[PDB]
Point group: D2
Chain length 116, copies 4
Amino acid sequence: CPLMVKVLDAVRGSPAINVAVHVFRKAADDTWEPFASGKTSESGELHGLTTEEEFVEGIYKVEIDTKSYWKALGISPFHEHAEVVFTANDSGPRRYTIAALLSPYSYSTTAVVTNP
Amino acid sequence: CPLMVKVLDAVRGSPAINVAVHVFRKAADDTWEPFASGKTSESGELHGLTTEEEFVEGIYKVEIDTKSYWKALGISPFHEHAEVVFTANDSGPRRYTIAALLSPYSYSTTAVVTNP
Amino acid sequence: CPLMVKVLDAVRGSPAINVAVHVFRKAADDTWEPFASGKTSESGELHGLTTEEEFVEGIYKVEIDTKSYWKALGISPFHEHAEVVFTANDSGPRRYTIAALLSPYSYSTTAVVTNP
Amino acid sequence: CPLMVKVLDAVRGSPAINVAVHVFRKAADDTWEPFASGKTSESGELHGLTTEEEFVEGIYKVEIDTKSYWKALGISPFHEHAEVVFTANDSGPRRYTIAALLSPYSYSTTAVVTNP
Ligand SMILES: CC(C)(c1cc(Br)c(O)c(Br)c1)c1cc(Br)c(O)c(Br)c1
Ligand SMILES: CC(C)(c1cc(Br)c(O)c(Br)c1)c1cc(Br)c(O)c(Br)c1
Ligand code: NA
Ligand code: NA
């Protein structure tokens, strides 16, 4: 998978299930173009967002809809979303896992980047 | 001080000094309007961004220019910047501290929301 | 796997490979008895520490040897290790993934707990 | 103040108040000898643990009684406590702040090590 997202709930010690994720790519005119979206599975993972061909060089924004997740669980959280912005593939194709750990007033995010 | 930002460096175990921070407020047309900005001090803190009168309820984005910070230290970073997007709510406590802990491929952020 | 450990390097954006991990279980006399040990693979994962039969109720300490990891990479870090202490299996068997994210002066740790 | 501890709650976005903190120093026989202790204040901070004269180089353990904190708030926690084990080094800066961010199934810790 060239781009995978994994999300964990720090209150429950579980995968964060059914979290909406939107990926954007910065366009030539500096706007954020919709690139891919999906929602995390029962494992907290989102696979299948893109393909090697379509995941070209660029600046990407992964927007994890944390508010919609907490509100569905009946919780009022602090953040609107968690947003990971990075340049991808600029020295050739890489595989990226974007991981996030969610609490109502906090989040942590990291990237695992590998060369196939 | 209704809004403060504090930034640490997890690689050096030190405040993150001279990091640019931009705060935006979401406008009615969903665009991000500049609201306040500054650079973190020797203590990693940015005070004086706004006033009680100016800081009304709404959605704010705090963008921390982490890429330039790491580059100035000679370290290769993953993110373009760190973003913190949140709603200010008058129903809650009245002082917001946005804290961030920076590593080259990760970051953590939390909100400390208190009343004097 | 009843107990798995995963470790990630926040400076490199990679698995943390060849990290030594020692698990202890608190004995009747309140000392920490050696329970299992191993080291993370190329994927940053440590499987095979224990079995369902041998992983009984108790208070466990997972000690991740972060200093030895950083020093092997030629880095002087702050912590001696990262230490995760928790009661396991006290309402019947569970599966535990202990995750850690390492920086030279920081670390983060979370648990994914599932019921088989 | 050569050693300070600050603790936040990631669920409430607030200092972690009245959390017990115990500091130990490693003795020659590898046992942990009590060194200092206290409870975090209304600001989540614990000052006055030691003095420059008492705080010599060595290995220290800071144990934060997170389980009791969460229980007092009616929240089910994973960890027995959070531990931070580190070496004090005179070669480095002279003031240590040990910071921790608490969630029920996770915690993060960092060191802010500075000179006056
Ligand atoms: C170690 C890593 C990167 C991870 C990567 C993959 Br892929 C996984 O499947 C799992 Br479970 C963990 C991780 C992620 C988050 Br979220 C954390 O809060 C912490 Br601490 C560590
Ligand atoms: C920036 C830093 C190190 C911090 C240091 C001091 Br001293 C403070 O008073 C505050 Br308020 C924040 C911090 C600490 C934690 Br615990 C975090 O989860 C994150 Br994110 C950042
Ligand atoms: Na290139
Ligand atoms: Na029981």
